Design a protein around this nucleic acid. Structure first.
Ligand SMILES: [Mg+2]
Ligand code: NA
Ligand code: NA
Length: 327
DNA sequence: CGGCATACG
DNA sequence: CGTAT
DNA sequence: GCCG
């Protein structure tokens, strides 16, 4: 009844097993902090299975036959159902390792490997990092300076304001170019921690060289607090607020229109949905999927897509709108 | 037991 | 190494 | 950690 891949089932943004999925995603996150990518994936998948269920899990027997629920994930649910709390999950929550790795990895420019190194060096707090700025990259200096603003959720009203300023710059850089909201907001989220935009032009080839022109114009408008030919730009924008402003993470991506459906699909996510979709494509259909295209390694040809609908069809999957890709 | 998505900056 | 879905 |  429950397909094994997340791309085979609708997953809405809000669901009926929130507490259970949030506990499993703690263990997934903790597995990532320890470099256990396989365990992270299983816990992520088990969490996503519960998001896709049509009603609350109330008894352990309801886990029978669900994919990705074995001894470990089932025991987590069992303890939550019986006691409202899972000892392992709570032990992770309060551990100095988990809390510090979470704090460090949330910094823009700090990954698991850097966080882990700092943790081993004895560092624990953001002010610990601020004391030795010579050890920081320019990207990390920016993430740390702006960390407080970047921790405050972005609202959909903020997104509409940002999209207008991006379109203004894009329109000057290349008349006719279009801006599409992607990421979590396209999946229906009301808040987020960053804003994702996909830029193209209806005339194949006209988008070449576009992103530097867009960035130079945003920078000339005083809107760029930070940014690194290129096709992805990871920016910190100055977003106006009442009598002030705040820093917001904004990602700008350009694709040629021939690849737009694949880039839209990839950048709309969720992250787990795209991993599962690419895994399904490769392992069940023998096709290689990325945010540029879909490749048949037998015939050595790329599939032409005019829409996301085309892509789902070429993979033999029922279409899922973005709001049902919240795996 | 091997595999676990796949890019770009 | 970092970033993104 | 789980699946095929
Ligand atoms: Mg996003
Ligand atoms: Na980070
Ligand atoms: Na983003």
């Amino acid at each position: 009844w429950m397909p094994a891949y997340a791309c085979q089932r609708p997953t809405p943004l809000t669901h009926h097993n929130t507490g259970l999925s949030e506990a499993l995603e703690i263990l997934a996150e903790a597995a990532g902090f320890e470099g256990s990518e396989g365990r992270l994936l299983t816990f992520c998948r088990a969490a996503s299975v519960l998001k896709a269920l049509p009603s609350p899990v109330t008894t352990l027997s309801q886990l029978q036959g669900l994919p990705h629920f074995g001894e470990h994930s089932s025991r987590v649910v069992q303890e939550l159902l019986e006691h409202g709390v899972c000892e392992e999950v709570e032990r992770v929550r309060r551990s100095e390792r988990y809390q510090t790795m979470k704090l460090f990895t949330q910094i823009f420019g700090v990954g698991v490997k850097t966080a882990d190194r700092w943790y081993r060096e004895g560092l624990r707090t953001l002010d610990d990092l601020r004391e030795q700025p010579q050890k920081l990259t320019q990207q990390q200096k920016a993430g740390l300076q702006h960390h407080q603003d970047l921790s405050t959720p972005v609202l959909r009203s903020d997104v509409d304001a940002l999209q207008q300023v991006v379109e203004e710059a894009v329109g000057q850089a290349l008349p006719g170019a279009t801006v599409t909201l992607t990421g979590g907001f396209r999946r229906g989220k009301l808040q987020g921690h960053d804003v994702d935009f996909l830029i193209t032009h209806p005339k194949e080839g006209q988008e070449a060289g576009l992103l530097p022109r867009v960035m130079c114009r945003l920078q000339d408008q005083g809107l760029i607090l930070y940014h690194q030919a290129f096709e992805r730009s990871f920016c910190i924008f100055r977003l106006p607020q009442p009598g002030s402003w705040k820093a917001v993470r904004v990602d700008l991506v350009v694709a040629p229109v021939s690849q737009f459906p694949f880039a839209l699909l990839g950048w709309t996510g969720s992250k787990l949905f795209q991993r599962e979709l690419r895994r399904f494509s490769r392992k069940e259909k023998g096709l290689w999927l990325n945010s540029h295209g879909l490749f048949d390694p037998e015939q050595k040809t790329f599939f032409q897509a005019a829409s996301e609908e085309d892509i789902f069809r070429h993979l033999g999957l029922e279409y899922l709108p973005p709001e049902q890709r919240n795996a």
